[PDB]
Structure 1
Amino acid sequence: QVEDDIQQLLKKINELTGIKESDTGLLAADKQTLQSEQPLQVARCTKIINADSEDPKYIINVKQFAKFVVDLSDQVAPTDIEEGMRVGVDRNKYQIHIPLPPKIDPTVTMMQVEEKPDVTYSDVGGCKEQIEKLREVVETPLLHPERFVNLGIEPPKGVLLFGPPGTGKTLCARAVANRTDACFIRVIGSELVQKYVGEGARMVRELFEMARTKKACLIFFDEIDAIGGARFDDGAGGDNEVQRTMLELINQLDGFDPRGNIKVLMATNRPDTLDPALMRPGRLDRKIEFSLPDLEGRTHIFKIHARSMSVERDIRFELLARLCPNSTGAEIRSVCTEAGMFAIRARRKIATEKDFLEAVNKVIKSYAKFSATPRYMTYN
């Protein structure tokens, strides 16, 4: 009341007090500058075919209009007007002014990440060797090109990941994407499936355009089974456009002037229908895999999901881990959350051991008819 009425009086006193400046002072924040931008130029952009000899004498296809032979203006450099270069050309006299970056196909612009999702390395504990190897590949050359040069090696420019579903692949990728420091570029595997023939090829072209422009970047591939796994050939002509997309992914990855400062991470759920051209190292070098957390892994993942929740700390966690022999971290998360939900049945602020036992026999033994991994452990 007193805070409310006094804050209303003070804030509206400042408001109605500046109202004197509002009704007394009589956009223009740029108006004179914008009218000095009226002697500027419309500057239509184009595409260059070739140059001529002894003179500039440049040749240009605009985009649709025609093709013209032009000359350069005086405020240009006679060097960086090379072929296949989107340059801004005068509308009246048809003269080249500024070279620019090329066409990027803007539906490919929206897969750079532009943010950082907050996932810390602490969330994948119990997978120490995998974290170690993937750290060794991804983090270390971008932050320390010291051991890799003074000993004279090349780090493995590609790492694939696999395992059963829900094992931490996506989560490890996001953990890298927190501490990446590079131009991390997401690619869903279904992004390369378009209506028209050979269009996903051009998407891969533009991906590696962006990759070669910006040095020291990361590209993440995700569920590469849609991108293409096998070249089953019959008298039907079936899955073929996907196959050409996969081949164009092969060649512009690694071979005949290799890739540069780019690292590719792939992640699949079923690494078994893959053409062994991808299985050739030099493209996909380290086969890092995620098995199930055996015994102590689930203790540690209980420590992960349990460290910031309202429980009774007098209980143990090892007995909880001993009842989950073939289980993923997702099922662990469901156990923790569902034990909380059983605590919401009553009105308590701390869990009990019986709540977690209800959670175990609620998740595992009940929904074990679905359970997602009796037919992916065999990697069908």
Structure 2
Amino acid sequence: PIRALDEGDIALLKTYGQSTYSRQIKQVEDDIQQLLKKINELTGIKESDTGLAPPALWDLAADKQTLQSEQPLQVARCTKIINADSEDPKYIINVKQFAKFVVDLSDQVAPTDIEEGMRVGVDRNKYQIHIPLPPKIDPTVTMMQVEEKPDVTYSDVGGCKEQIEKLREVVETPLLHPERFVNLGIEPPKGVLLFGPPGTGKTLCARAVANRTDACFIRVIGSELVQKYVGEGARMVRELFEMARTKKACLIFFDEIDAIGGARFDDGAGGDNEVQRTMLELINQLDGFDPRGNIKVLMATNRPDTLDPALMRPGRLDRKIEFSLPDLEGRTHIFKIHARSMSVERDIRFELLARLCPNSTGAEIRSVCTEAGMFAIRARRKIATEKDFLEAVNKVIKSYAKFSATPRYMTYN
């Protein structure tokens, strides 16, 4: 029986209702909406065309000197040399992606200064050779060094002494004291892969090593190891290891190597094809008919079960280290370490919270120490109390965010 709405019905409906000043209200709102547009249009996004050094510090040279820089000094193009015909001035070069060519050496450069494999400054027009270019050091590859010292010492890495000793036996002593490994002639194990449930300090210990590496600690940003064009990843890893074999005692960390490594297969789109190729290049570099040298590899994962076998076997990674959940003493020490900067009452027994947090991890221990004084901040106190910490534990772990077993459930006494 739902009869439609007629035009007159709509017209009357729009005008029978309390609108003493409502048409004006809507009109003024529309005016405001149309005025914002004018205001921003006339104050649009400007002053963003940066890139200009202040032609005041070098203002004097920021002038016709620049034109003098232009015109002469022809812009060259980079290119390698694959041969240099001896006693025949002809050279052969491969520019990069354009094509190969045969080039003559410009008079300004003596042939002796130009060798095989070096980078030459070939010019446009007629590809002649000019001032040679030094060997490249790629930006992605060189943007990986730690070049800093993260603020985490070994002391703060609590709850695991055996693990730290195991790691130290391969990452620190075999480089800072070769004597112990000669008297017995024991080959220092190289390649330490850290397992563990999700969140246990596997990355904490890796960071801690960086504070005393006294050498390069290249950090493999796995996401960078994969790029669109094929072969990019293999070249990336090769340059990684080539820069590795250029200093003394270089340690290379592959955080979350699960991204680049995985069981091979040819079923789904031939696997990842390119990703598997990068993994294979890495494996070959780690072990193969080309002894690596003085470079060590640390890798961490949440699940080692999904690693390609040709990478889990010894040789590539020797010292596997479980990182199991902390013990009672481990938990007590972890609480003490992540409580030493907290305004906590002196009478707090941390040996009890440890028991009340079973099967927890270090991240949980933190999230409990924090969110512990958070209840104090909620109460507007300044020195948290043991009751606060205990409530935090009950509201973070064990019961966490879901406690189904509660209604008349007391069967464990």
Coarse TM-score class (shorter-chain normalised): 0.7 to 0.9
CA contact (8 A) 1:189 1:225 kept: no
CA distance in structure 1 between the aligned counterparts of 2:107 and 2:407, rounded to whole angstroms:
72
The runs of 5 or more residues in structure 1 that have no matched partner are: none
CA contact (8 A) 2:145 2:218 kept: yes
CA-to-aligned-CA distance 1:318-354 (integer Å, 9 cap, x gap): 0111111100111111111111001112222212110
CA contact (8 A) 2:264 2:271 kept: no
Change (3 A) 1:10 1:190: closer
Residue 141 of structure 1 deviates from its aligned partner by: 3.2
Residue 2 of structure 1 deviates from its aligned partner by: 51
CA distance in structure 1 between the aligned counterparts of 2:409 and 2:214, rounded to whole angstroms:
34
CA contact (8 A) 2:255 2:301 kept: yes
Change (3 A) 1:346 1:134: same
CA distance in structure 1 between the aligned counterparts of 2:120 and 2:366, rounded to whole angstroms:
54
Change (3 A) 1:28 1:189: closer
Q: Comparing both chains, which one has the higher relative contact order based on Cα–Cα distances under 8 Å and sequence gaps of 6 or more?
A: 1
CA distance in structure 1 between the aligned counterparts of 2:294 and 2:221, rounded to whole angstroms:
21
* Residue 37 of structure 2: aligned partner: 11
Residue 284 of structure 1 deviates from its aligned partner by: 0.4
Residue 40 of structure 1 deviates from its aligned partner by: 7.7
CA distance in structure 1 between the aligned counterparts of 2:405 and 2:119, rounded to whole angstroms:
51
CA-to-aligned-CA distance 1:43-101 (integer Å, 9 cap, x gap): 64321111223466532233466645456679989778554332345779966666555
CA contact (8 A) 2:357 2:398 kept: no
Change (3 A) 1:328 1:374: farther
CA distance in structure 1 between the aligned counterparts of 2:390 and 2:266, rounded to whole angstroms:
52
Residue 312 of structure 1 deviates from its aligned partner by: 0.6
CA contact (8 A) 1:49 1:59 kept: yes
The runs of 5 or more residues in structure 2 that have no matched partner are: 1-26, 52-59
Higher alpha-carbon deviation: 92-101 or 40-49: 92-101
CA contact (8 A) 1:164 1:373 kept: no
CA contact (8 A) 1:168 1:329 kept: yes
Residue 293 of structure 1 deviates from its aligned partner by: 0.7
CA contact (8 A) 2:395 2:401 kept: no
Compute the TM-score of the two structures, normalised by the length of structure 1. Answer: 0.79
CA contact (8 A) 1:312 1:350 kept: yes
1:286 to 315, 319, 331: 319
* Residue 24 of structure 1: aligned partner: 50
Compute the TM-score of the two structures, normalised by the length of structure 2. Answer: 0.73
CA-to-aligned-CA distance 1:116-164 (integer Å, 9 cap, x gap): 2211111112211111121121112332333334554432221111110
Change (3 A) 1:191 1:158: same
Change (3 A) 1:209 1:90: same
Change (3 A) 1:281 1:145: same
Change (3 A) 1:34 1:165: farther
Residue 11 of structure 1 deviates from its aligned partner by: 44
Higher alpha-carbon deviation: 70-79 or 175-184: 70-79
CA distance in structure 1 between the aligned counterparts of 2:115 and 2:406, rounded to whole angstroms:
56
Residue 205 of structure 1 deviates from its aligned partner by: 1.9
CA distance in structure 2 between the aligned counterparts of 1:368 and 1:21, rounded to whole angstroms:
50
Larger Rg: 2
Higher alpha-carbon deviation: 63-72 or 300-309: 63-72
Residue 114 of structure 1 deviates from its aligned partner by: 2.9
Change (3 A) 1:190 1:79: same
Higher alpha-carbon deviation: 213-222 or 270-279: 213-222
Change (3 A) 1:6 1:262: farther
CA distance in structure 2 between the aligned counterparts of 1:244 and 1:124, rounded to whole angstroms:
36
